[PDB]
């Protein structure tokens, strides 16, 4: 069968387990791999696009860069890992301007630096389109696995909910983002939270949304459990731009590259957790919670896939 | 200025101090990169490159696979980094067959599995020509770094020297492989040589060969000293594919591929050093000396890069 008719996510089911290894602090599938080395977890991502596939209107090479490595330090960070360093594989066509290169990869390092990672170096090769693709590395004490029990609640971390997805369709629709300053920062520069680390050994599991929370959501279904969303953030500009809330609770359900963490929380450490969150300056928000079953639900009513 | 105009040489050297660690255990620009992390020099590396310029004739995906994690890991094992896993980006026409993109991951997770190590998954994107970058990282208790002082003893690790430039060679000239086994072996299945680690702690430094022997030699002298070339191994299939000692030294030092590494042995510990190498199965060649002053020369004469 060939790749089209396959479709992306079976593809990657069927590559998931290839080589994994079978004593990992994370199983297969999950936002990030990685092998238990000298007590630690040492965990490796590699994200890869097309430049013409990132680059929303107003964002040129650096935001690109930046974007990258965001990316990538986000599934690290979702799995309860400190990134300490990025490498970049770049394809460039021939006639390229070099001012080009150099944004990316210092649009790249800027991301790299507000986490206190580095760039390890990488490598360049000629290709037909610009591609990259940003690998990373991260050490965790605690490896978070996408995992639930009956009984935990659901929260999401972060504030890109709703606006990652505003930007992506005001660019498809062709409309300006003048007086939407924090969705346009959503999109050019999303900032992946060292935060998350404050909850590092209090979580059950957790999964990182980049394509979209209604689609995390079933992904944490499938691993056997049902979903119960009771509240989700609506942020006043995310509104403001939708024009109502049903139209706001789409572009937060099915926007995309939100690239922040859904967290499954015990009931037993919620209360501490929202300390701790609280404490640290981490954005959370009490979204639901995990039952017995199947399905996933938004107030009663069955959430689409 | 054009990338086309600008030269591969000149934008790594722009791009490589770019976000890199000033504490770090190795320098900017070297096999790898990485980062002391609780005692231990954590490298990370990632090597790219489009099928059709690595695919020889009678190399299917299985075999592309399997070389680009035998670059990444060696690489990193010049460095005397142990490599323990590696992650895959690949870049894939929405028509390939799903068998060819089966054969390049168990073909990468074959040639880590040679070295004890494994593939932590990765990420696949539409493109319009097949194009793979290998993440890997390593844990190394010696970082080496490209080093060499005056004095210095220079040695040519392993046994691909000559033979991956003679199967370029054959693909280009339409010439058939029968008959000169280890040649095709060194272009199909480059084994990554873990027994180089047998060396940890005893050598100045090293550079890994991808890209060619004169290549690499050049960018030993960049360091800051002279490359004087004694005498180089010409493997007796070498020499018969190639017909004459000088279209074999050719091959030799103008082939690519090899991935061997070229180490520089201080005088005072280099009895010791081949002793540790034949007791672990290293093949070990010595080729010359490191000399105050600059340029590469060969047996006296200047040796083209």
Redesign the interface.
């Known amino acids: ?4 008719d ?1 479709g ?1 996510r079976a ?2 089911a ?3 387990p ?4 079978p004593e ?1 602090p994370l199983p ?3 936002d ?4 238990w ?2 007590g ?1 977890a ?9 430049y013409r ?1 990132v680059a929303l209107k107003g964002m040129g090479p650096f935001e690109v860069g930046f974007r990258g490595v965001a990316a990538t330090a986000s599934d690290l960070l979702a799995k309860m890992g400190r990134p ?15 001012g080009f ?2 944004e990316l ?2 649009g ?3 991301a ?2 507000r986490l206190g990672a ?12 610009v ?1 990259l ?1 940003v ?3 991260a ?1 965790a004490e605690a490896p978070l696995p996408r995992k639930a029990l009956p009984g935990d609640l659901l929260y999401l971390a972060g504030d890109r909910w709703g606006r990652t997805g505003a930007a992506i369709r005001a660019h498809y629709e062709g409309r300006s983002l003048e007086g939407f300053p924090k969705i346009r920062e959503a999109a050019f520069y999303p900032l992946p939270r060292l935060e998350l680390l404050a909850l590092s050994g209090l979580l059950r599991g957790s999964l990182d949304s980049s394509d979209g929370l209604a689609e995390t959501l079933w992904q944490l279904a499938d691993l056997g459990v049902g979903v119960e969303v009771e509240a989700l953030p609506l942020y006043p500009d995310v509104l403001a731009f939708a024009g109502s809330e049903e139209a706001a609770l789409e572009l937060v359900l099915y926007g995309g590259e939100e690239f922040e963490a859904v967290l499954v929380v015990p009931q037993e450490g919620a209360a501490a957790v929202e300390a701790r969150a609280k404490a640290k300056g981490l954005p959370l928000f009490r979204a639901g919670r995990v039952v017995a079953g199947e399905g996933v639900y938004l107030r009663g009513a069955p959430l689409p896939r």
Chains 1, 2 share one sequence.
């Open positions: 069968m060939r790749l089209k396959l992306e593809l990657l069927r590559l998931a290839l080589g994994y290894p990992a297969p599938g999950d990030a791999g990685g092998v080395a000298e630690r040492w965990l490796l991502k590699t994200d890869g696009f097309l596939e300490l360093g990025f490498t970049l594989g770049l394809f460039l066509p021939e006639d390229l301007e070099e290169v150099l990869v210092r790249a390092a800027e790299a630096k580095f760039l390890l170096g990488g490598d360049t090769n000629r290709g037909v389109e591609a693709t690998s990373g590395y050490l």
